[PDB]
Assembly symmetry: C2
Homo-oligomer: 306 residues x 2
């Protein structure tokens, strides 16, 4: 096996490719339509946000920028927001591009609160989305909540351009998952370490050259890059695996598929995303490859075909 050959295990897992499709549609819209579309989608999303994600040492990184924006006029604020959407090369857009996803999300959450408070320039009254933007908004509002929030997140994170430590949860307070059909400690402890933010232990489950493929992204290859990804993107998730299957693969490898739900700290139990994990484990029972997929619909939770 190579990483690229591992990518196709369990090939009839149907993923929610409407998400990258919809993001690509959003990417065609001009900056003002993008900002207005997100405003409308966000307001109409009946899902309340918790800002336990993006903590203090993290959000300290965007404080300077947020203080700059808070001192500009409504016209300068609008230009900055458009520079972000346009991925323009400006000092603030470069600052934004340096941040992790949760810092970017917390930044926009604060601007959104200030917009409802009149502290930051609002979407102009009586604004009309372009014909294409109106159709993108309608498509988003037809998606399952888990897909809606992934579209919004990825659009936010793609904006801009030109990590404090995470201490794991105390052992006594930790939960342990139960996965129907799966007894393998490498899979069980992948989930338990994730749920405890115990990334320095989790990385030891991988082969030295092992790879992790997040939803709609390319494989991240090797312990150094995977550990960096854990530390930067994976804090405070709740993984709720339900059921899985295991089967032998070529050369003494083992392939395992698990389905279940994931909650993000931004929405807690209010949004459950339907996920699959597809593992290829080495003969020594280490993770050579794991893919994490956002599933097309709840019907895919029952698709456990070997």
């Amino acid at each position: 096996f190579t990483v690229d050959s591992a990518r196709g295990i369990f090939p009839n897992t149907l993923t929610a490719d409407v998400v990258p499709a919809t993001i690509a549609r959003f990417n065609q819209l001009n900056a003002e339509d993008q900002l207005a579309l997100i405003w409308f989608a966000y307001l109409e999303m009946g899902k309340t946000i918790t800002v336990a994600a993006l903590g203090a040492a993290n959000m300290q990184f965007a404080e300077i920028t947020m203080n700059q924006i808070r001192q500009m006029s409504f016209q300068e604020q609008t230009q900055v927001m458009c520079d972000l959407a346009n991925r323009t090369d400006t000092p603030i857009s470069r600052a934004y591009g340096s941040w992790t996803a949760n810092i970017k999300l917390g930044f926009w959450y604060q601007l959104g609160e200030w917009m409802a408070q009149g502290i930051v320039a609002p979407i102009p009254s009586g604004y009309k989305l372009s014909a294409n933007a109106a159709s993108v908004l309608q498509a988003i509002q037809g998606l399952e909540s888990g897909q809606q929030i992934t579209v919004l997140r990825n659009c936010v994170v793609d904006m801009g351009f030109d990590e404090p430590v995470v201490v794991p949860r105390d052992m006594a307070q930790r939960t342990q998952v139960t996965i129907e059909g799966i007894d393998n400690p490498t899979v069980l402890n992948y989930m338990n370490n994730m749920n405890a933010n115990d990334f320095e232990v989790l990385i030891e489950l991988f082969t030295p050259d092992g790879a992790l493929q997040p939803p709609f992204q390319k494989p991240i290859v090797g312990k150094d890059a995977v550990l960096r990804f854990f530390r930067e993107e994976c804090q405070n998730l709740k993984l709720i695996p339900e059921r899985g299957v295991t089967e032998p693969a070529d050369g003494g490898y083992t392939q395992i598929k698990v389905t279940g739900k994931v909650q993000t700290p931004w929405f807690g139990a209010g949004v459950g995303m339907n996920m699959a994990w597809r593992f290829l484990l080495s003969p020594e029972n280490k993770i050579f490859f794991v893919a994490i997929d956002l599933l097309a619909s709840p019907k895919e939770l029952l698709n456990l075909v070997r």
Copy 2:
């Protein structure tokens, strides 16, 4: 100034473009390399459209001759790996060579490989290959698109693989034709269309302001005469522009906004495929192009969408 390039992008915002094309490309980009190759094989086979002899013998293929002949001599296993390296945008000598090529060389390369696949010279899509669930759905989506949208999906997928010519002679004035656009007599728009059809890019570039920009379908504004002229020379050769209808309206500061709808034919398919397009011009008071966007329209209905 009354406009910036980014503020010009939104002119005629009721124009409904075929964003199903970038959406479907994004779905295709989720598939692994072998699935991508098989999907394009079946999509290319299901299309009933023929590539022209004039594009088939394109002299620029000499840049790719050595690489193709190398591939032809490889084993089927090596050939498959090369093709996957291309789909994966891997850093290899062959993928770097492909990434150095122009779009037209890239298309001719894959046309030749596909011919060789049918002739038993290059490794075929394996006989017992089953598309993934996602890939089968993407293939079904492509089959439901208008041919002009199908070929745009296929072209963009080809051009995006890999990584890690002489300019056409303008046609003699005596041999040129003149477009006719119902509703539009603006000479800058007519001159844009006629110079494009004549491959007279050095005259065409003089129609733009120095800070002026051109926005190709599903791409970002290309800003400045140097960048735009390089784009004309590299990409826009031997097209046939068939504008039919248009509307002109005043814009701020004495500018003029013009929308034209019509059809475009690529030299790859000749008259076999007519893509429904809009051109959206923002002209300075001095009659120069400050911004022009070229859109692939969502459906033929949009040819009649000529409201402000």
